[PDB]
Paper text:
VMAT2 inhibitors reserpine and tetrabenazine are used to treat hypertension, movement disorders associated with Huntington’s Disease and Tardive Dyskinesia. Here we present cryo-EM structures of human apo VMAT2 in addition to states bound to serotonin, tetrabenazine, and reserpine.
We incubated VMAT2 with TBZ prior to vitrification, and obtained a 3.37 Å resolution VMAT2T map. A rod-like density in the central translocation funnel permits good fitting of a TBZ molecule, which was also supported by the overall stable molecular dynamics (MD) simulation trajectories. Specifically, the last three helical turns (Residues 313–323) of TM7 unwound at Pro313 and stretched into an unstructured loop (LuL7–8), swinging towards TM1 and TM2 of the N-domain to block the luminal exit. Similarly, the luminal three helical turns of TM2 (Residues 124–132) unraveled from a hinge residue, Gly132, and ran along the newly exposed electronegative cleft after TM7’s relocation. Its high binding affinity (60 nM) to VMAT2 corresponds to its occupation within an enlarged hydrophobic/electronegative pocket formed by TM1, TM2, TM4, TM5, TM7, TM8, TM10, and TM11. Mutational substitutions including Y341A, F429A, Y433A, I308A and I395A, had varying impacts on TBZ’s binding and inhibition activity against VMAT2. In the TBZ-bound VMAT2 structure, the carbonyl oxygen is oriented towards Asn34 on TM1.
Numbering used by the authors: 18 to 48, 123 to 474
The structure:
């Protein structure tokens, strides 16, 4: 049934973000409050840029041959990424494995969201199922850091990666049992061209909303006071703890608020999420140390869950209303906007760091978010 596809997408994004985020206890092994590292900048941005580039081709590919085959391709390349990643002694091998993992993340996310939207035609529980998928993303990024840390500090370096690989194999067994991509299943009608879809005001407004929210995240994580040379208290706790607040708030907000955002007015959800994101990003620089950095994360993650659960079903619904019922290209647009923030995070952050200080960057990012928030009013009554 439909819930089975929902579970497939849930666990696919769960394992995807688990593999994405389990790296954090391992990044220290390779070599005022907020500072950037050029070594982690390429590590943080190579996956994002590769996945950025790889998105629209996969959208067209799902439009061409079907949904399950790209998901199984995501299985194959994520498994080979884990295999080449556990043994990745060198930094170049690490970057190449991250790029392969990015291709896998692109196909998994785009195809899963597209088929989840296609099977769930009506918008009443469409928001619910996209909220559940994003909750799977949040749960994966929540369980990543501490699982990786305990497996690294109790067994060894390769043990978390091998255990995650076994979990991926169980996932792929489930995929083969469920989707069965035995034959190519072409779509009934040709989809709306990607270039024509970018000539749309509302789609671009939603894409900019998601891009600015994820940029609000992405300008902070590579610059967190983590993964230095050494620590007085040996650190090793912040590595597994620092992503608890944002992930917990994302999970809670998305899961509890998708249905109520459908009820109350989803443009209102977008606007409130943008306002709270701006407030949180603007109040990050007013923190003396990492002691006070925990509080604004609970707000920024909550509001970015708001934005994601309030714009991904709109990405589906705008094309459902004003275009043909083909979702691959529009969800490729949604995800390319979703990841452009992470892709341009390190370079833009470093340039603006060389120019001015970080607190001014946080204030200007919050100002842009606040000024862009009223533009979500245009989505109340789309023709
Ligand atoms: C290794 O660098 C990464 C670090 C982190 C993430 C992804 C990364 O890979 C680029 C995820 C992914 C997201 O989407 C964000 C979740 C927010 C919105 C709660 C941020 N988290 C947490 C930290």
């Amino acid at each position: 049934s439909r819930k089975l596809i929902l579970f497939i997408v849930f666990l696919a994004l769960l394992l995807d973000n688990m593999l994405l985020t389990v790296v954090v206890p391992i990044i220290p092994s390779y070599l005022d409050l907020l500072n950037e590292n050029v070594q982690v900048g390429l590590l943080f941005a190579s996956k994002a840029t590769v996945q950025l580039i790889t998105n629209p081709f996969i959208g067209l590919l799902t439009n061409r041959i079907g949904y399950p085959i790209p998901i199984f391709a995501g299985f194959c390349i994520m498994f080979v990424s884990t295999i080449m990643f556990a043994f990745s002694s060198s930094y170049a091998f690490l970057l190449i494995a991250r790029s392969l993992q990015g291709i896998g993340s692109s196909c998994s996310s785009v195809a899963g969201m597209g088929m989840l939207a296609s099977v769930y035609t009506d918008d009443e529980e469409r928001g619910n199922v996209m909220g559940i998928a994003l909750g799977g993303l949040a749960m994966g990024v929540l369980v990543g850091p501490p699982f990786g840390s305990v497996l690294y500090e109790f067994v060894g370096k390769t043990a978390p990666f091998l255990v995650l690989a076994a979990l991926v194999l169980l996932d792929g067994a489930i995929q083969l049992f469920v989707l069965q991509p035995s034959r190519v299943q072409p779509e009934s009608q040709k989809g709306t061209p990607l270039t024509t879809l970018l000539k749309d005001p509302y789609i671009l407004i939603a894409a900019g909303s998601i891009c600015f929210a994820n940029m609000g995240i992405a300008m902070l994580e590579p610059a967190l006071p983590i993964w230095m040379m050494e620590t007085m208290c040996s650190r090793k706790w912040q590595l597994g703890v620092a992503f608890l607040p944002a992930s917990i708030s994302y999970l809670i907000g998305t899961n509890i608020f998708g249905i109520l955002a459908h009820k109350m007015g989803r443009w209102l959800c977008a606007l409130l999420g943008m306002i709270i994101v701006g407030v949180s990003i603007l109040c990050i620089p007013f923190a003396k140390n990492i002691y006070g950095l925990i509080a604004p994360n609970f707000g920024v993650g909550f509001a970015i869950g708001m934005v994601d659960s309030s714009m991904m079903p709109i990405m589906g619904y705008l094309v459902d209303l004003r275009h043909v019922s083909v979702y691959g290209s529009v969800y490729a647009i949604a995800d390319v906007a979703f990841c452009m923030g992470y892709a341009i995070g390190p370079s833009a952050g470093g340039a603006i760091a060389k120019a001015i200080g970080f607190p001014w960057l946080m204030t200007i990012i919050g100002i842009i978010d606040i000024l862009f928030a009223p533009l979500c009013f245009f989505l109340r009554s789309p023709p």
